[PDB]
TrEMBL record, chain D:
It comes from Echinophyllia sp. SC22. InterPro entries: GFP, GFP-related, Green_fluorescent_prot. The keyword Disulfide bond does not apply. Pfam families: GFP. The modification Phenylalanine amide is found at residue 60. Belongs to the GFP family. One of its GO terms (molecular function) is identical protein binding. Keywords: Chromophore, Luminescence, Metal-binding, Photoprotein. Cu(2+) 2 binds at residues 206, 208. Cu(2+) 1 binds at residue 196. GO terms for biological process: bioluminescence; generation of precursor metabolites and energy. This is Fluorescent protein Dronpa.
Length: 215, 217, 223, 223
């Protein structure tokens, strides 16, 4: 039920340090090529008082290229879909929790996202908007208690050079019984391609490919 | 006069655990100078709650803490304007709860606007299986960092079979006006659910807290 | 087994960021009043290139005043004694692992201590010796898998004010079957009372008292 | 060039796990430019080892990593004078291991002095019950901070009955002379025990590592 070219629609409602906001996005991707892009609009809470990069890994592992020799948990879960929950622990104490419920209508994936971040220090790179980009990363995926887990430890490049680390822990839950994968990896690369001064409009790109490590 | 011997509480929580939304409203009373409060809580949406009610109860205000004259009281100084706080609660099995409270004052009644979001509680864990009994008493340590008051507490839920399930709280407190800042100190806490109905649609909750400076006694 | 006045002898061997050192100590204390004091000398690896305070909580919960209300896992364990293992995680990523095997010879406890600290940054408060003292602390003890655990989240105060946080996780192991206590707390207060310029001589004091949290009606209301 | 296509390794490790000391010595050989190495290891004291041998094996040299010309090689620039590293290893049930290695070069032989200290491994956990199978392949990220090189790796042990036991590595790498610092990059690893006797008094250990810089925008898969 996956076509070479899929559409994406999403809404995110959330809060950082107790300030609410809301973002909507339309996008396109090629699930068997592991590539997606999307345009995102802030609809409430603008101009955002925090670094936009903390949102972008939240904005669907169906858009990862899986080799034949690895079980693809995500494409197997449609038409019914799947959801995920995630905690993002930054190295200065900032914590974000996020959830995404992913459903499918026709050729369009539809995401409902909730995001809540707390304890970002006022003088930190997130609240001062001093991030540049996420570095390329490698996610580890493994089964525990009948569902799929993913961990990624990565970092944001910063305006003066330097790196601000963050650790992701994700739980993926298919809405039907699916084949379960063995331990594997997905390399990711996400960038903001364009944006306006206050990030009211963002064009965002991601590329992901599954592997098995040093062969 | 601002902070009276007896005060009222009004609150609404909205939140989600593992992506399941719910909402709760509360009405209560307390004694700010005695460090004691109680409240009755009603699930308004998302009931019956499919998780342990105990992960909510420390989210349901440090103005209700007995401060000796030895220690600057950040929280009573902050009224009438009020203060807000943010907290992350890290459970030893990977369950993470983020919460925020904005606390204002209308006459003799505190009003809380609470948001709660928990993720990654495992289906077979004591939270989703409702195997918790109560929070142990705890000691919070409060200290200033970069102009605001921080509080940390490492504590544990007692569980049904005997056993303890640990959690780390990290709270940032932000007064809404400039107040005098306290030196490093502690608050001892003790929170209990004194009654509840079977599915916890109605909960009666009590807390007791006193600040101190540690040893000597 | 446990006299009102007891003595202490210790030897610690360790490394910080891969640089080795060794310290010997003698002392005295009162296990029932929760007080002790010891004199410490650097034998090897001096002058110490790191903040001495990272060592001092490693230099025995037998020196803690327990009420009869709370089962005393530690006083129960002698003559045989007990051991403990500890990891201390500082907020900037420096980690110290320590072990202590505690035996008893006459009225003198003997400690065999090992200490290993890694990843302290060059310009942090440990390597640059900007620490002042440990704050008073509260360690929570609880049973798991038939042994006693204790966790403490505390902090060192810094030179120009401010605090440097550290989490301790300790495992206590009696060398014999003892009765295990319920969940409880030990308050602590550790202080360096005197030292010379580079801490090759240090006099250290500790006071420690067990309790069970905020009471419904506290006893401290007129005899 | 001080780095040759074939080079030998000599090492001694002394350490302890939950207070029980041991020592291992090893001899090996590896090809730094192909990123491969093998070694034979012998328990010299403290055997038979009461813990899973796997906790030791990532401690038994990033000079044996295949670096492309595209990425600065911090480790091969550091010789002959060499470099040292410190590491904490944080297992998901509370077990923690701190380790250090001081690496020098003698002729064309690498010499390691290793210190290992692990604490708080539960008695019924997979390490003390020896229920581990192997480390999964891993990816290390490397970045500069405070003018030295850091490496982090989050990985897991595979366990006998199925399932995985996670561990987080944090390493500091310090050249002994001034070298040029790399940009953010990665090393994929793969470590396996090729053979061992029943109590692991003798082990043959192999490792493969290659450096890279992440998912390419297009990549050299053009044909």
């Amino acid at each position: 039920v996956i076509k070479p070219d899929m559409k994406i629609k999403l809404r995110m409602e959330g809060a950082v340090n107790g300030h609410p906001f809301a973002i909507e996005g339309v996008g396109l991707g090629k699930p068997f090529e592991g590539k997606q892009s999307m345009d995102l609009k802030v609809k409430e809470g603008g101009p955002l008082p925090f670094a936009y990069d903390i949102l972008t890994t939240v904005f669907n592992r169906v858009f990862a290229k899986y080799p034949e020799n690895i079980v693809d948990y995500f494409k197997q879960s449609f038409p019914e879909g799947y959801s995920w929950e995630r905690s993002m622990n930054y190295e200065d104490g900032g914590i974000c929790n996020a959830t995404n419920d992913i459903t499918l209508d026709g050729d369009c994936y539809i995401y409902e996202i909730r995001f809540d971040g707390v304890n970002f220090p006022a003088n930190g790179p997130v609240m001062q908007k001093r991030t540049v980009k996420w570095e390329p990363s490698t996610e580890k995926l493994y089964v525990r208690d009948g569902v799929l887990k993913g961990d990624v430890n990565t970092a944001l490049s910063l305006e003066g050079g330097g790196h601000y680390r963050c650790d992701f822990k994700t739980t993926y839950k298919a809405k039907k019984v699916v084949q379960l994968p063995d331990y594997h990896f997905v390399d990711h690369h996400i960038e903001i391609k364009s944006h306006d001064k206050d990030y009211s409009n963002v064009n965002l790109h991601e590329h992901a490919e599954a592997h098995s490590g040093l062969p």
